[PDB]
Amino acid sequence: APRSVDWREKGYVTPVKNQGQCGSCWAFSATGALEGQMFRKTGRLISLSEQNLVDCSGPQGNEGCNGGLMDYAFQYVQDNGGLDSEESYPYEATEESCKYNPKYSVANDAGFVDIPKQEKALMKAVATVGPISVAIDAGHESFLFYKEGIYFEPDCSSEDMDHGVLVVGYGFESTESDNNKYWLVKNSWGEEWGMGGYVKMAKDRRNHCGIASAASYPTV
Ligand SMILES: *[C@@H](C(=O)N[C@H](C(=O)N1CCC[C@H]1C(=O)OC)[C@@H](C)CC)[C@H](O)C(=O)NCCC
């Protein structure tokens, strides 16, 4: 596999969004992965509606601001036959009744692929597919205050993920401890958090924070 990957440089990644005070991380993770696979197919990068997922994918198992799963979001897009653009169905950070309008649908998918629960398989997926939806343990103050560098949290769990984000690449940089490898992760807490909204999460450190345990992407 390549030693460094960054899908932002290939145009697969929209700007950082902000989920506000709603537990809708899963919706931003899913739109991020579908944005990348739609661009892979069509060469047009179109921001997708998280509100559409939050309001409408309950029948697939999602619970709006009370949490969800990216895979359920991908199943909703396939079941529904579409997903509206962000511009047409703007984000409101609260669950409302479903207002999907097929006329403004700009994305589709045909299923999704779950990645084996190893960082080696995640790396191969990131290298060959595009941005990947993943779930992490983001429940530590260290993660709130992250500013730069490779994020490593000794108390991070690889089994209890609470946060859906998007791996857009990986790479390396020299460090004091010589744990040099990172996943390049897009968060949904706005551009003020972290490095312009991104975090470098420790890679190849025993599936740190569970980043490889629930990874998937939509098939377009
Ligand atoms: C994922 C989720 O939304 N996470 C949630 C979160 O990001 N916020 C809660 C309110 C505003 C943000 C925040 O922390 O801003 C600083 C918390 C619980 C993360 C620490 C959602 O709970 C979910 O569906 N998780 C399951 C895995 C996809």
Swiss-Prot record:
UniProt binding sites for Zn(2+) 3: 71, 114
What does the entry list as the binding residues for Zn(2+) 6? 160
Which residues are annotated as active site? 25, 163, 187
Name of the protein described by the UniProt record:
Cathepsin L
- The gene coding this protein: CTSL
Q: Where does Zn(2+) 5 bind?
A: 137, 140
Q: Where does Zn(2+) 7 bind?
A: 162
Propeptide residue span(s): 176-178
Species of provenance: Homo sapiens (Human)
| Cystine pairs | 22-65, 56-98, 156-209
